[PDB]
Amino acid sequence: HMLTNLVAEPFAKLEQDFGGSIGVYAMDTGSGATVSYRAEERFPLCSSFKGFLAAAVLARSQQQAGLLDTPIRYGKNALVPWSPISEKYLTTGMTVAELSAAAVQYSDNAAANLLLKELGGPAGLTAFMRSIGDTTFRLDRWELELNSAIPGDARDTSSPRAVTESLQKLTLGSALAAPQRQQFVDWLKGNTTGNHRIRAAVPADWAVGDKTGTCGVYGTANDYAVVWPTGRAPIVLAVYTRAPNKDDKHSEAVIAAAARLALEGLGVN
Ligand SMILES: Cc1c(CP(=O)(O)O)c2ccc(Br)cc2n(CC2CCCC2)c1=O
């Protein structure tokens, strides 16, 4: 149930056309069958950390009654670039739950930084990931500095394999209480930024929740998802890219193509 070889040559050709590195890990939750390609290499998380951030908030909500309903007020100086929800509520504030939804479904930067502050910063989110058994994940910096994607720099990285393992634990396993688990799924399902990535490889009659990341440099962008094919167990998968030159462009088409190859490798029609 390493189907990694059905699709190892097509992944290598896709990566050669792209001109960089592609990292994939895909898990069939029914059989436990996996597809790996550069699955243990580090890639920059970019915005993809915001899904784990929302899950860490949900975990804390199990301990702290009322956390999700707490109003948060912020100044103009909190509004960093790409804050499309939080800029509309500057004069009013938003709840923790609303910031978490904005962080997940619009990749809202100001919302992500405000929730990082609630958790004790990048070290607090790293702490939550260690708490679910993820020893690979590290967040080191805040938005926007975490997007530097410097070749060889382990800061603000994880592996495709650790991202998939943690995503399965949070969405399908026992890392969150059932209500919090379904809220995390529902936030991922409502994501607006991923239509050209994993979703572009998934039939319209299958449910999917995803979180994107785009660093803006070094051909670096990513997506992770849970996919619910009809008539079989869910699939969890992560697709990360980087490239050697700062002005290399990312490709959403390459992420969708990689997701297609992972699903073909798992035998999902
Ligand atoms: C938050 C954010 C996103 C959405 P996501 O990261 O989830 O895919 C985004 C998406 C595409 C591009 Br092209 C630039 C982006 N930027 C700007 C880049 C990262 C920092 C400056 C350049 C976003 O901030």
From Swiss-Prot:
Q: How is its activity regulated?
A: Not inhibited by EDTA, inhibited by clavulanic acid and tazobactam. Inhibited by cyclic boronates, including vaborbactam and bicyclic analogs of taniborbactam.
GO biological process entries: beta-lactam antibiotic catabolic process; response to antibiotic
Active site: which residues?
A: S47 (nucleophile), E145 (proton acceptor)
Swiss-Prot/TrEMBL catalytic activity = a beta-lactam + H2O = a substituted beta-amino acid
Any idea which GO molecular function terms this record carries? beta-lactamase activity
Q: Which EC main class describes this enzyme?
A: hydrolase
Q: Which UniProt keywords apply?
A: Antibiotic resistance, Hydrolase, Plasmid, Signal
Ligand binding (a beta-lactam): S47, K50, W82, S107, N109, T212, T214
**EC number(s) in its UniProt entry?**
3.5.2.6
Q: Which residues form a coiled coil?
A: none
Instruction: Add the further remark from the entry.
Output: Initially two different KPC beta-lactamases were identified from two different Klebsiella (KPC-1 and KPC-2); they were later shown to be identical.
**What family does this chain come from, according to its entry?**
Belongs to the class-A beta-lactamase family.
The record's listing under NCBIfam families reads: bla_class_A (NF033103), blaKPC (NF012141), classA_carba (NF000538)
Give the protein's function.
Class A beta-lactamase which confers resistance to the beta-lactam antibiotics, including penicillins, cephalosporins and carbapenems. Acts via hydrolysis of the beta-lactam ring. Has penicillin-, cephalosporin- and carbapenem-hydrolyzing activities.
Return the protein name: Carbapenem-hydrolyzing beta-lactamase KPC-2
